[PDB]
């Protein structure tokens, strides 16, 4: 039992902003399909495709009713009638009630606590599926197994794997290897070295473009920044690290001033990973 | 044995400059650097990213590997060498390299021009003196040495890339 949390920038972690739109009740349930077609051909809402156009509502007895998302509100959002909002003959407003203003999410939700606030106002589009969840689990039991091997040997208990999501082919597994002679062989630095030596003669030095990295615990500053330099596309990790740079102390995967950004999900097999070693 | 390295800053940095020029010529980000322990150069590195096809192979990390090789081959504890080593580099260490020098417990970096795209000693983040109780020790910086010369080479390189 576990769940994947997105680490987004502070800017994107806040509440989704709202904008005002006009909605109207569907008093004739059997006009719904027809009215949805005619309305969203006039008001296709091209910049808010995450909004569902039909909002259901279960009565206190299960009796269902619905309002329809007519259009966005203008600069002066006063009361507005059906005759003023929907042109004719292009729309036949039979079956609709008097329009009303409703706040709606301006942008699609990203975090699951943002889906919560946003579905409160108006239903939206959207975490991981069964098939994917099991697959991400397999890659993370692999890093855990690797972290345990390092702990038994005498090294830091940090496991990393690099995976190609196009074929789900593991490209490099490695654990921490820091020694007195070689103190910077953190789990992430070892995987980047392993992918690097395995790539072909015609390769750009962005050794990790497109690839996913799963690591037991969140990378240190050195590892994280290297991931940005290497152009990893997604990073999954289990437990945070106190000095971690993908969510704890820094969020280098989501800065504007670096020429690369990437998604980070924390909390995958976190129950197991939490008892392992933090980076560094 | 630390400030003893600082006396030839002129010479040490002139030599870092000649390597930045080399990197420039070989389509690498023009950044060169030396690592001086007890007035002897124990490690040099220019940026080797495009040659090795390994994004992490920055000048500073090529030099660190070279010092660690020197420590291995001569049987010297890297802790006692790095802690009295000064790094001379023509460009302010990136965020990654700054964390590297911290974890190596290097005490002092002398550097040239600001790293506006990736700098880790204040320009983008301040990894160099941040409060990171588990990421090594913070180091100190003498910025600015021959910065006008060094920044020109960056500006040249990026006018040259796609
Ligand atoms: Br999930
Ligand atoms: Br940040
Ligand atoms: Zn690390
Ligand atoms: Zn660097």
Author numbering:
A (entry chain B): 25 to 150, 164 to 317
B (entry chain A): 14 to 175
Wording from the paper:
Given the ability of inosine to pair with uracil (U), cytosine (C) or adenosine (A),22 the A to I conversion at position 34 provides an extended base pairing capacity to the modified tRNAs and is essential for decoding the C-ending codons, as GNN-tRNAs do not exist in eukaryotic genomes.
The ADAT3 V128 residue (corresponding to the V144 residue in humans) is part of a large hydrophobic core located in the middle of the N-terminal domain of ADAT3 (ADAT3N),21 while the ADAT3 A180 residue (corresponding to the A196 residue in humans), is buried within the ADAT3 C-terminal domain (ADAT3C). Following structure determination at 2.9 Å resolution, comparison with the structure of the WT ADAT2/ADAT3 complex revealed that, unlike the p.V128L variant that mostly affects the ADAT3N, the p.A180V substitution causes small local perturbations in the structure of the ADAT3 C-terminal domain. Here, the crystal structure of the ADAT2/A180V-ADAT3 mutant complex did not reveal any defect in the ADAT3N domain, but rather local perturbations in the α-helix, where the A180 residue is located, and in the ADAT3 C-terminal domain β-sheet, both located close to the interaction surface with ADAT3N. On the other hand, A180 is located in the long α-helix that immediately follows the ADAT3N domain. While the p.V128M ADAT3 exhibited a significantly impaired enzymatic activity (−68% of A34 to I34 with the lowest concentration of the ADAT2/ADAT3-V128M complex) as expected, the ADAT2/ADAT3-A180V heterodimer retained comparable activity to the WT complex and the ADAT2/ADAT3-A180L displayed a severely diminished deamination capacity (−76% compared with the WT complex at the lowest concentration). Interestingly, the p.A180V variant that does not affect the deamination activity of the ADAT complex as demonstrated in vitro restored the migration defects as efficiently as the ADAT3 WT construct.
